[PDB]
From Swiss-Prot:
EC number: 1.5.1.3
Upper lineage: Eukaryota, Metazoa, Chordata, Craniata, Vertebrata
Subunit structure: Homodimer.
Stored PROSITE patterns: DHFR_1, DHFR_2
GO biological process: axon regeneration; dihydrofolate metabolic process; folic acid metabolic process; negative regulation of translation; one-carbon metabolic process; regulation of removal of superoxide radicals; response to methotrexate; tetrahydrobiopterin biosynthetic process
Function comment: Key enzyme in folate metabolism. Contributes to the de novo mitochondrial thymidylate biosynthesis pathway. Catalyzes an essential reaction for de novo glycine and purine synthesis, and for DNA precursor synthesis. Binds its own mRNA and that of DHFR2.
Name this polypeptide is given: Dihydrofolate reductase
Keyword Cell division recorded: no
Organism (species): Homo sapiens
Primary gene name: DHFR
GO cellular component: cytosol; mitochondrion
UniProt GO molecular function: dihydrofolate reductase activity; folic acid binding; mRNA binding; mRNA regulatory element binding translation repressor activity; NADP binding; NADPH binding; sequence-specific mRNA binding
Residues that coordinate or bind NADP(+): 9, 15-21, 54-56, 76-78, 116-123
Length: 186
């Protein structure tokens, strides 16, 4: 099993969601970036694992669930079985990561990507060990009801460049944004 990563897109006021949708209008290349980063595996014959909370699962359109080309895992203590379309369900991130040590996942999974929401990012960012945060800074305020926790800059380093990730300002639909990559190893 490869590296542990978070990936998020976040507005200037730290928002990540609104009424079960993104706070901003659709940004095609931000979506393409999310898809390519979470799908691309360094290892032949393996797929990456995407871990998400229950609300994030149901925020994906039914036609696009489960996320194609990736193994999907949902977090919930209320659900008794993985939701329709999913095959894995854990009560916590700690349980999900321990599940990657069992043969049904250990042989199949390369990278692990946490894709939201708020409480999943919170558990991951405090998880000990090597972690990277792939953070898209949307350079505007948007009305939000779900937020990204502030990054502890005493634990994380901001990388000036990361391989395959453009470091310049992006713009779509009048909205500027930037791809950032943070890293820690405690
Ligand atoms: N901009 C982005 O990058 C991004 C990414 C993802 C989602 N979103 C948007 O954010 C919103 C959804 O995110 P959200 O924060 O509201 O909810 P969420 O984390 O996806 O789902 C919350 C539910 O999932 C379970 N859960 C979450 N964290 C858990 C943990 N560490 N351990 C065990 N269970 C956990 C709990 O379910 P139970 O109550 O059943 O236990 C919780 O009620 C939507 O608006 C979505 O469009 C944005
Ligand atoms: C692109 C947004 C994003 N970007 C970054 N960088 N990291 C994230 N974790 C993140 O969330 C992705 C959650 C998965 O959403 C999918 C996935 C496939 C199809 C449709 C949706 C729902 C769309 C986004 C909506 O809600 O409109
Ligand atoms: Cl921050």
């Amino acid at each position: 099993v490869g590296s542990l990563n978070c990936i998020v897109a976040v507005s200037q006021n730290m928002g990540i969601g609104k009424n079960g949708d993104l706070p901003w209008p659709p940004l095609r290349n931000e979506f393409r970036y999310f898809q390519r980063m979470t799908t691309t595996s360094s290892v032949e014959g393996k797929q990456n694992l995407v871990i998400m909370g229950k609300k994030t699962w149901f925020s994906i359109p039914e036609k696009n669930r489960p996320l194609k080309g990736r193994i999907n895992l949902v977090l919930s203590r209320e659900l008794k079985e993985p939701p329709q379309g999913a095959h894995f369900l854990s009560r916590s991130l700690d349980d999900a990561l321990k599940l990657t040590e069992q043969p049904e996942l250990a042989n199949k999974v390369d990278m692990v990507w946490i894709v939201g929401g708020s409480s999943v990012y919170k558990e991951a960012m405090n998880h000990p060990g090597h972690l990277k945060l792939f953070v898209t800074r949307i350079m505007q305020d948007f009305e939000s009801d779900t937020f990204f926790p502030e990054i502890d800059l005493e634990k994380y380093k901001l990388l000036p460049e990361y391989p395959g990730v453009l470091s310049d300002v992006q713009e779509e639909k009048g909205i500027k944004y930037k791809f950032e990559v943070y890293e820690k190893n405690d």
